[model samples]
Target: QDWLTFQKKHITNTRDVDCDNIMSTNLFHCKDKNTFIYSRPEPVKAICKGIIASKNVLTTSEFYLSDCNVTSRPCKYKLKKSTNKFAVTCENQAPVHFVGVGS
Candidate 1:
């Protein structure tokens, strides 16, 4: 889906200023026409949608799971071999969450 529609459909809690700003900032990073990287603790579905909305192909994506301690869930995703953009998207959200792309 497109970025605008994707946000409307997947993102929630838009009333909060911080949350809105966070989404805005993250969405901006999703604008790169050639390169992209994203790592945040936000919803995984949103992340994938944002990547696709930003015109990136899922050639590769890196996902991590929460610590299995007392409470946690495990999830998996993959990204294929591709060009490495020098700039990295690190929002300091967690251990690591990433989506990468190349032409």
Candidate 2:
């Protein structure tokens, strides 16, 4: 399907979605909710951005913040972009692994 263009082909090949991982268009690699996805096709990008922006979380690019293994303000996760390198900051200081799809 057209959506598959950026979404990963298989879950087995992807890492568990986390803050460390920057969102790749490919679904299989990283499913981070905030991972931004712009269609590979130029025409699709313009058409989809507006439509998805208004949709609920299920249909949109954003995802619910998961709690880190710490406090309620558990501080779940916050993203920090390092020139494309995926990163996340958690309250517990738990290890956040980066699963980047080439930066």
Candidate 3:
């Protein structure tokens, strides 16, 4: 229930939205970095049940990502768009944390 909300708030995005504002709004602070997947929730959620590679679960398909890096202290960010395989931590069969892009 709540995990889905966490996924929606931090992980999923259907648009090329503003990562700076979204991060600031969700975290209420200037985070050093963050990533948002341009995907529907179902596909990302399925990763939890997928094969485990080491500590994190890897996505079978590549996802478009909004990679945000902090450029300044006042919640500023630079967004880099890319399509790649991502890894994530799962709990209760839901994605809880983004591990990173898989090599």
Candidate 4:
């Protein structure tokens, strides 16, 4: 069995995959699409833009203009580094699930 790193991330007591979240991934390879695991180790680069609160909407730097596929986003998560909180984003356009505080 694959041992997941417990970080008190999204989905509760789950493991940190890729950058955290995207449970369908497990070893994502940006150079090759076929190597994508879609569990906890995606090849997709998270492009973490610093952790933020789950009560916030998409920041100007959140999503890039190139990703035209998304219009309405989740805009929220229960993450709050100040409170050891955990929350999923209101949307799935990006990966912010593993963010926030926890052991």
lDDT tens per residue, model 3, 13-85: 5557686677687553667777788877776778777434334678888888877788856688888888889
lDDT of 1 at 83: 28
Clashing pairs in 3: none
TM-score of each: 0.18, 0.20, 0.76, 0.16
lDDT of 3: 0.71
Best by TM-score: 3
Poorest lDDT segment (10 consecutive residues) of candidate 1: 65-74
1-103 per-residue lDDT for model 1 (tens digits): 3333333322334222232223234453322121122332244334344332133333244432211111122222122223233212223221122333222
Q: Backbone clashes per model, in order?
A: 4, 6, 0, 17
Better of 2 and 4 by lDDT: 2
The order of the candidates by TM-score, greatest first, is 3, 2, 1, 4
Candidate 4 C-alpha lDDT tens digits along 9-98: 222222222322232244321211111112233312232234343332332222111100111333211211221222223223334433
Q: Count clashing residue pairs in model 3.
A: 0
Residues 1-103, model 2: lDDT tens digits: 3333333321112223344433333432333234432223332233243342222112223322221121233324454322232222211222122222232
lDDT of 4 at 68: 9
